[PDB]
Design a protein around this ligand. Structure first.
Ligand SMILES: OCc1cn(-c2ccc(Cl)c(Cl)c2)nn1
Ligand SMILES: *[C@@H]1O[C@H](CO)[C@@H](O)[C@H](O)[C@H]1NC(C)=O
Length: 353
């Protein structure tokens, strides 16, 4: 079990002003640290943030958080369930800022909600240095869904912060799970008139203004003011990063099909759309040396207990991550770039059921 610690700096808060926090399980015999970012969509205006506060309050507030949580998947401490990093120090950071981990704004007389996702990550790092993170050799910043996108937005700032605090020996790396999205054409098209019909590029554009969102500077300098929404899309922000990042992405991600207005007897027009989506995602990973991209229709995520079962070209994700570790000290029979090439959902027999 991982135990809850609320942040001692109570100015760093969830959406409703309650303090943010983290769940920790230490491993005294390890200099490896894994910091995982929870996901779960976002909100970008007053109407749909109020709605999220009614029926998804744990993603906006800490007042009902439990004292402990069980580590699963890559956060498990049993080698049977986690062949990769079972002996590492484990940290689970709840997602209570609804800003794709990008915000830096407090609740005030002009803001009903606080959006502090970027500052939450930095304060967790600062308070963990007193918990033994000061002795680390590798800090792996991982995340799923909106947390996977948050890895891409924040991994270089974490490396930046540890350098200016005087810890240059800590190697910072990233693992982005199911947060690599495309700003493609929708299958059926709707103008941004309400939350349902607003495409991701439009919603992110308004979110950044509503959140006071921040993006990596090198990406910020390419796209500049008014256009920072481009940095939320993995294939645009990844080439600007300096830290090593491993990318996990289904070729037919369910969240991607949702924002494309696809809801699954497939006729020709939809078949070509789905097949073209798989091609485009494969194409964006072509220059990504560390990646895992199975041809599955799925919403599953690397903290699930059976994450070891899926294979690409005969290699599992825990093995690919171990190969990545070795490559950061090409390897015989221990590959790191694993992208399916078959064109339809579940053509890989090991896809989740
Ligand atoms: O849980 C699924 C999910 C997906 N997203 C998400 C995050 C960023 C972008 Cl740019 C898009 Cl298009 C979608 N956030 N949560
Ligand atoms: C608390 O966090 C805020 C926001 O990140 C920061 O500006 C401030 O310096 C922190 N205060 C202390 C005492 O660490």
């Amino acid at each position: 079990d991982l135990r809850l610690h609320l942040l001692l700096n109570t100015s760093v808060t969830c959406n409703d002003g309650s303090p943010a926090g983290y769940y920790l399980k230490e491993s005294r015999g390890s200099r490896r640290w894994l910091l995982f970012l929870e996901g779960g969509w976002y909100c970008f205006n007053r109407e749909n943030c109020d709605s999220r506060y009614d029926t998804m309050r744990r993603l906006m507030s800490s007042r009902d958080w439990p004292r402990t949580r069980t580590g699963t998947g890559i956060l498990s401490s049993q080698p049977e369930e986690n062949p990769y990093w079972w002996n590492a120090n484990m940290v689970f950071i709840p997602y209570c800022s609804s800003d794709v981990w990008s915000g830096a704004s407090s609740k005030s007389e002009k803001n009903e909600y606080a959006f502090m996702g970027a500052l939450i990550i930095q304060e967790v790092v600062r308070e963990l240095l007193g918990r033994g993170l000061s002795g680390a050799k590798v800090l792996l910043l991982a995340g799923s869904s909106a947390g996977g996108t948050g890895v891409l937005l924040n991994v270089d700032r974490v490396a930046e912060q540890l350098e200016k605090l005087g810890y240059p020996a800590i190697q910072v790396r990233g693992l982005a799970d199911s947060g690599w999205f495309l700003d493609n054409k929708q299958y059926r098209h709707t103008d941004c008139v309400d939350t349902i019909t607003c495409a991701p590029t439009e919603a992110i554009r308004r979110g950044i203004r509503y959140w006071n969102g921040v993006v990596p500077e090198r990406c910020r300098r390419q796209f500049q003011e008014g256009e920072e929404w481009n940095c939320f899309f993995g294939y645009k922000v990844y080439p600007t990063l300096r830290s090593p990042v491993f990318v996990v992405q289904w070729l037919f991600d369910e969240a991607q099909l949702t924002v494309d207005n696809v809801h699954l007897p497939v006729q020709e027009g939809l078949r070509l759309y789905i097949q073209n989506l798989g091609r485009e995602l494969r194409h964006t990973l072509k220059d990504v040396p560390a990646s895992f991209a199975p041809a599955c229709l799925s919403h599953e995520i690397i903290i699930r207990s059976h994450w070891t079962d899926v294979q690409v070209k005969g290699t599992s994700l825990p093995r690919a991550l171990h190969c990545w570790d070795r490559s950061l000290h090409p390897l015989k029979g221990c590959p790191v770039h694993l992208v399916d090439s078959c064109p339809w959902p579940h053509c890989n027999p090991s896809c989740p059921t």
